[model samples]
Every structure is written in structure tokens, then in C-alpha cells.
Target: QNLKSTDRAVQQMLDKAKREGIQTVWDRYEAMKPQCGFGETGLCCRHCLQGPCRINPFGDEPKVGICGATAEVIVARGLDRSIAAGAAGHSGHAKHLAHTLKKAVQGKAASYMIKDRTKLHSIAKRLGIPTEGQKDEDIALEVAKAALADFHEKDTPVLWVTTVLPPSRVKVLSAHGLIPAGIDHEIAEIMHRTSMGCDADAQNLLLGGLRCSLADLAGCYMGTDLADILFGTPAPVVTESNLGVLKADAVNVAVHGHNPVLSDIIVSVSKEMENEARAAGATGINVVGICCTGNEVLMRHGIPACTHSVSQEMAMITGALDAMILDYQCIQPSVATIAECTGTTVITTMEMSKITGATHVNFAEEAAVENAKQILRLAIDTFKRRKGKPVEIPNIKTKVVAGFSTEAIINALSKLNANDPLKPLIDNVVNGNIRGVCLFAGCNNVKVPQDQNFTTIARKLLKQNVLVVATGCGAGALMRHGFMDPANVDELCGDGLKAVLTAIGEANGLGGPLPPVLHMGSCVDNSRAVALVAALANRLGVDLDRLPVVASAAEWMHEKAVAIGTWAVTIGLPTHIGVLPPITGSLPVTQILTSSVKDITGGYFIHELDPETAADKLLAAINERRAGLGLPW
Candidate 1:
């Protein structure tokens, strides 16, 4: 109720739709909310047989586990499972990259090699390989091996480096024997540590858990290698965000959640389906996205996509969405429920969270394109059959200018800063008599007025000249609304950021408009941001604790998001998160996150409802750290 604004336009639409008998995505959304219990608690682990122990903090922090494991063991076990799940997701993506590289070499995927040749050459140079005329598979093999090697080579410097962890946290991880010895080994070890009754000490369990997260090194190695090779060195590309951007006169298809391997292919099919859409009495093919999948394409393509799960429903409400490509974590059981409410053809793919209500399409590794065409044709058919009635779109939308990824940021700033491998624009923001930088990343929720909290925080940070590196839905909101592009960087950013943007602005004038906010890819890619800060800290010889860096999220909700925050603090950055997961419904559960989290590290948990306060709290956190570091605020 608080999220939906009651403006005159909304009222007018309500009256208009009432007369038209057309249902809205919101109407369906309001009808079906998730009846989530385990998902809410973040304690839904059933690997062992004795107990699928769910800690109901409201009742008691149960001394329970399948094999008589303690609460700490259970939490660690759950965390390990989550990480494994995360790893598996990426592994699938990587496997596809390997196969694609093979096929692209053999003329299968049509020579999909190094779209951004310059970046590829740069990566090849770094990896000790010749870039020109090298077969795509050769490059892919070199890149893949280099990346896979990091899982076992702790000493190897992370490739596409990024970070924001404070020095103290890094030191603590080092001191506590939590540093990862090898990538795959660490993941396996964490699983072993959490197996049954092992590692019951909560603190040690968490510290060991930290070793599995590839924050600085692993993320960059994968993200950059792929970005440079697949999606041309991302520049400031203009795109839209949110479900409202769904076209009324086109065949709308929403690709929800993360994973560029699949989403990128979906993009390919949608383009092919454009003429097919126009033939069916629609404008063309409109492919919008939600969550990180949106970030993946939006960062490179700058095309309008959806924001989060909330907007998934919003897109449906527009009655514009013909078929939604389901993948990763954006599945709402209610998504299928909505199909019954409206004539929307809800199709479910992937096994993670399949909506029983929608038709399931089993996705194969190599058969992606064929499967995509089949689904797309059905979606178009759904569009044509919808002659029963037109629908009403919400009077909600903000223009965003996306396509500022970490790669984009590095390249753009590099061009500005003499093409140095490491850019110092962010350092200027912290210690050089300038303001700070805020890394506002995470999911979107119906917590505040749509993206009000996100915009409020981003707008405030921009006003202070604090550079914002936003990803996921937060980035989507800003990008779709035009706040994250170079044109509005000054209009939206603070004086210090304005000066930073001004310096970068001159470069933009020389090189068209620059993307304002850097949209690093999916949730896993947040790991890239962490690595970026760490590399920056190392390069500038500045302790992360002293740098004006912050990780804030408003209306964010996800188990992965929580784990990411935990990893952030363990590495020493201040991460601000809002709208606690349903798991923290009780005081003990909440305390475990807020107060007890402090026991594990120096960072704290803040659940802010007001967007301004959330923004201020993060700003204050950054400023306080800066003051302590004897740096200018």
C-alpha cells in the first residue's frame, strides 16, 4: 500500500481500466503474495536426513540440525549450500562459455569471438597471448584456464580486480585463517566444514565461510574476461528500466534474474522475432529484463529492461508482456498464479523455482537457440490471440541512462587518466578534498514508493559529488530514469562528483556522453565491485577502512544479498541493507543479523524505511570512516 502512489494519473488509469475491463499487473500482484517460510528465514537446509531444521527465532534459536548439528553448524551448512548453489549457477554459465567458445570456433554459434577486439587484445596481452587472428576457442581456453586456475592458486593475483573491503577486515580474515587457499578448494572445504556437526563455532563457521567467497580476484577474472570477449567494452549506452518501459504496441518479453549466457541468447532471438512481432500487429520485439539479467544487457546495450521482482508483476500488469523468460532467482510462485488471473502466458524454465502453473521448458546446454525460438513463437502467438482486450499501464516510470559497467568505468576513466591500468578518479573523491563514493547495490522491492529509496539515496549521493557505483535493481532504477548517464551526472551528482564528472565530462565531450553510474553485472558480479575496491586500495596504498567507500541497499531482500553483505564486512567495508529478509522476522533472528553480526566483524546492519535516512546513514558511515582516516570529507 505504501509503495503504490495515489497520484491523479493513477486514479485516472484506475477509472480508465475500470471501464475497459482490463486487469493490471499490480492487480494480480496484490492478489498473490508469496507464502514463503523457509525462504524467509534463510534456514531452509535439508541436505541431511535427520532434520530439515528451520530455526524459528520467534520460538527459539533451536539447537537443531539433521545430524545433531548446532545452530552455528546449521547456519554454516545453509551458507555453504547457498554458495554451492551460487557456484553451480556460475559453473553452468562458464560451461556454456566453454562450449560456446568451442562452437564459435567451429562455426556453431557463428564465430562469437571477442566482440570488443581491443578489450580482447588487452586481455590477451595480460594473459601472455597474441590477440590478432587467434581462434576464439584458443582465447576462450586461455581465459577459462586462467580463471579456473585461481580456484586452486591462492597466490595468483585476481584478473579483473575490484574491491571495497576495509584493511582491518582483510587483516582479520588473514589473522583468523579465513583467506582462501584456492578457489574450488575453498568452496569444497567450506562445504566439508559445514557438513554435519563440523565448525559449530559460529564465528569460525563464518570466517571459514568467508574463504569461499571470491570477492577481489575470482569475480574480476570471470566478469572482465567475458565482458571484453562477448559484450564489446561497454560504453555509456542509453537504455530504459522498469516494467513500465514494456511496449504496449510490441511483443513484450521479460528475461528475469541473472546469467548473461542465457539472457544474451534471448536477446539474439528477440531481435530475430522483431519482424515476426510487427507481422502479428505489434510494433516489434521488446525484451525487457529484471534483476541482474537486466543489468547484464543494460550495462552493455543500454536498452530498457525491468528492474526487480516487483516490476515483474508491473510488466505483466501492463498486459504488454507476451512471454517472460524465466531463469535464476526471479521466479515468483505467484508468477504462475498471475497467469490464471490474466491471460498472460506464464512460461517457466530452469528447475530452481519452477512455478507449477506455467509450462516448463527444459533447457539444454547447446540447444538454447532452438528452445528460444520455440518459446518466442509461442509468445508471439499469445500476443496475437490477446485481441480480447487492451490493458492499462501504470503511470509510473522514470527515465534512466544505463550502460556504465565496471569495465566501462575503467576504460572510460582510463581514457581520461592517460590510459593507466588503474584509474585514480575515485581516490580523488575520498582524500583529495573531494566528497565520497557510495556503492548502492542490491535487489528492488515494494518497500518504498517504487524506487524512491534507491533514487533518494542515489540522488543525495550525487548531490554531494559522491560517485555512485550501483548494480542490480538500484542501477536499473537510476539508469532507466537517466540519472546514471554522463548527461545528468552533474545535474544529479554533488559538487565533488560534479568536478569528478566534470574532469571525466571533458573526456566525454571528446568521446560523446559517458555512462554516469557503473553497473557491474549480477549479484555474483557484486563480487567484482569488492575486488575493484581492494585493487584500488592496494594501488593507492590506502586502507579500505579509511577510504570513503560504502555498500548500501534499500528495499533489498535475498539470501544471497545477506551472504554478500556478510562477506563484505568480513572483508572490512561498511554495507547498509534495508527491508530485512523474512528470516529476520523475530528479535533473535534480527539480532543475529544486526547486533550479532557486529560480533563477527566491524560493520553493522541498518534497516531504514525512509529513503533519505537510508541515504544519509550510508553517507554518514562513509564520512565517519573518512574522518577517522584523516581524509577530507
Candidate 2:
């Protein structure tokens, strides 16, 4: 009933909105109170022309949909659709990056170049593409082509899924017909299978969802690789976040989207155009980030991150933002309205992701150099318009240590044990110095209080000695709130986990403790967690399910979060979704997801809403995995 967020800055913004009669996502959520029960319960179906049917969840009306589809079939179909859509969202982002990388290597994109030759060579070698005497561009071309092939290949499995996952895990998927033939093919198959009467069996529909979830995993892995090759792998970079990152005395430009291409260049051009900003009587070009675009720039360039999905509108409420540049994904159209109200110009860079009232500047990597200069000029010029406008920048911000790529973590580990990097971590887990690892991901949902679950549950897990890793808005939420602040190691972590983190930090020359929560990356970089788990599993001579690693999306609302959680389960980790998914209407389907699937996949879904209780459930799952490994909890 209240403002929904635990953030003081956000609450201040909501207070301002309340006085001004302005609407926000929380307000809208309140307006849509007692939302459709059928949709919430997964009882509504429109898969067939026979009818747009709604089954009675309480059995007061019809028990079946008009097509005679049972609750199980309807629920399974809904889940498959969600998983497919999630896969499509991730795959679409990867396909764009992969294509651009290909074009860059072919000398077609003038503004783009292979930024990280080391990563390119490594990826090429991993993909079985020879790089012995090849130039960087040549190797990049091969890598790009290979990544692109995963989308189109029908005869074989997606390259990333097959190669990144261990053979033991792959065999399990293959045995169940869950190996993804192609990224697009699997998603298309889901669409086809979920069509009326195509895959009515609950188990069959769930398998279809699992196959599509693998495609999601492939897309996430592929996307991270291409991003690393093009933008350079993320290393620990210091930055600040929260709405307080917005500076009132400077030309504040917030890049609010998912892609790095435009945002990355903006980071570069901001420096080059600093003189222009100075000449305009402003401090300088201050480019902060929002959403995953925020994650990209903050990890690489240490640019301040401003806000996440639900609270994006609140960024403009600071009344200091001169311009907001948007590329794609998780950007609410209402941002334009908020920008207009605050006298901030919203610039849309992607042609396909344009808002109705936003300024459109088509960003082409071919002309990215010029495009970035133009965008910077616009932000600098807009600074003049805010000369006399009222501004209230929040004073609350937190320091974050981001850009912990899998390579960086390993490098840190090597400092502790040069001969066997993972030994210290493994030994600690075996000795109960650390209980397990939990990956916190996904987005903030209005249905649940914003960021409350993540913070509450992360502290609970940390107190129990569970190492937490975060990505997407989950990272944004925690980083802004200090979970990813290294100082929190002394406050939130258990004595055992604190000792482990302190040893690693000291060995790695951090001069203090590492942050209690590891900031992996954006939604796509869930690959890094998978890679870490896979390495541990291989070393232990067991499948992924045997490890005490779990994933949770405590405040999830996005379809991509669904795919990520589902694939986490498919890859043999018990995944927790805090905001219950809409499959509860069907008892059979819910049972399969929550319990029976564990018999087949050694993993299952836990749909717990309370964050403290969710932490308890995850700890129990970890204990169960530990017992299976013959290790003490």
C-alpha cells in the first residue's frame, strides 16, 4: 500500500510525485489491484480458435477450458510460451551483437573493432576454430561466424550449449530430448508445440519448455562471449550507484537500456566532448547508467549507475538529468512522460525500440563515432535548458566493486593457490567454512516490494555462509544497497564466509575483504555462474546437480528471468523464484515443476514468496546437495 521500495531516494521521489499528482509504476500497480485471477493462476487460455477459455480455479464454474484442455495442459502451455519468449528476448540481443561483430571483422563497421584480442583468441580456440597464424580480425570473423551459426543450425545442437556444458549434463538433456538443436529452432518448436492440441501432455510440454530453456542458456552464453570480445572482459571496476549518482552541476546523461554498443561509445565520447560541456558553462559530460546498459558501462568504465526497471521514472524526478539515451529492453515508455515532466530529453538510438515521443537518432556501428559525438552534443546542449530548473539530487549513493568476470574470480583464486586455483574454495565448502553459492538474478517486481526480497534473503544466506552472486537488476538492487560493497563483508557475512572472503581478498591484494555478494554481470552474463559451477562439478567428478549451488530470482517479473531460472533448474540447480509463477492453477503441472522433476533432472523449482523463508528453503536445498556429496552442512 505504501511506496513499495525500501530505498530512501526512491521514497523521496514518490513523495514528490504524490504532492504533484504524478503516477508511477507503484501507483499503476495499485490501480490494477486484485488483477485477473485466471491470468494470475494460469487458467486462461487463448491457444486455440475454439475459444479464449478460462477455467475456474475454485471449481465453481467449468473445470476445463472450452477446448476441453485440462488445467495441466493450459498451465504447461503458458509456461512454454513464457520460456520461449524469454529465450527469444535473450537470443534477439545475442543475434544483434553477433551480427555486428561479424560485420566489424569484415571491415564493414568503421567504428567497431576487436577490442579484446585475448578473449577473441581464447573463444576461437574453445570453439575449435584454429587461430595459430590468423590475425585478430580473421579470428574474430571465425568466432563471429561460429556464434551466428548457433542461431541457424538445425542439424546440430547450439554451439555454446554443447561446448560450455559438461558432457555429463549434456547426456542428461539429450536423454530427455531437451538438447536444443538451434536457438531459433527450439523457440519455434515451442510455439508450434504449444499450439492447440500439439503437446497436450503436461510432461511433454514441460520438456519442450526445458529444451527452449537450454536455448536461452545458449543465447546467454553466446551473448556474453561476443560482448566480452567486442567490449573487453569485465574486471573489477569501482563505481557508484543509486539515484544520488545524478549530478546537478554537470550535464547528466543517463543511458537506460540493455545494449553496450551505443552506451560503450557514449562512455568514450563523453571524455572527448568534455571541453564542449565545459564551454557550455557546465561542469562536464556526466554519463551515468540505468538498467543493464548501466551494468555494462559501470562494469567497464566505472560510470555511475542510476536506477533499475520499476524506479526508472524516479531518475528523471531528480530533475538534474539533461538527457536520457535509450537503446533497448526494460525501458518503460512512461519514461518519456517522466522526462517531459522533468524537462529531460529522451533520445532513442535503436530504430526498433523507439518511443512515441522520444527523439530518434539511429545508432549504426558503422557511424558510431559520429553518432556518439552527436548524442553527446545533444546532452551538452540540453544542459543550458536546465539552467534555472529546480533540481534535487539525492545524497544517497554506494560504492560498488563490479566487473567480476569468471576470469577475474579465477585470477583471484590463483593468488591463493597458484597450482590449484579452485582448491581453497572447494576445501572451504567441504570443511563447512562456506555452506554453498547462490546466484541472485532477475528483476524487481511490483507484485513484491522492490528490492526487499533480494536484500532480506541475501543477508539470510550470507549469515548462513552461502556465497551470493548477482546479475541483472538483482545486481543493481544489491549494489545500490551495499550488498556488493566490500565493506559489507564485515557486516553481513557469517564468520566463516567472512574469513574465506578476507583471505581471498588479502591474497588478491584487495587490502580488505571482498564484497559479500559477487557482481557477475547483466542478465546475459549468467553464463559466468554456469561456467564456475561447471568447473567445480567437473573437478568433483560429478554432475552439476551434485554441487551446493543454487539460483534465485527473488523479485522476478521478466520473461528472461523465467528462462534463466528454468535453465538453472535444467542445468541441475534448485532454482527459487520468489514471486510465484502463474502455474499454481494446475496441480499436476505444479507438482512436476516443484517435486517430480527432481527425480528426472536432480533439480526442481521452489516457489516461496517470503524472502526469509526463501533463504531457509535454499539453505535446505544446499544442505541436501551437501549430504549427497558426503560433505557436512
TM-score of each: 0.80, 0.98
CA lDDT of each prediction against the hidden true structure: 0.62, 0.89
In candidate 2, position 593 carries an lDDT of: 90
Clash number by candidate, in order? 39, 0
Measured with C-alpha atoms, the lDDT of residue 392 in candidate 1 is: 70
> Which candidate leads in TM-score?
2
Question: Which of the numbered candidates is closest to the native, going by highest lDDT?
Answer: 2
Which ranges in model 1 have alpha carbons more than 4 Å from their true place? 4-91, 106-108, 121-136, 148-175, 181-192, 215-224, 348-354, 360-369, 414-416, 419-427, 430-433, 446-452, 480-482, 485-491, 510-516, 581-613
Predicted candidate 2 versus true structure: per-residue lDDT over 393-469, tens digit per residue: 87999989888989888888999899889889999999998999999999999888788999999989999999899
Off by over 4 Å in 2: 1-3
The sequence of per-residue lDDT tens digits that candidate 1 reaches over residues 184-271 is 5666776687776556665566556555554323442465456447756556655655446766777777777666666777787788
Residue 265, candidate 1: alpha-carbon lDDT = 74
Assess the local accuracy of residue 170 in candidate 1 as a C-alpha lDDT between 0 and 100: 51
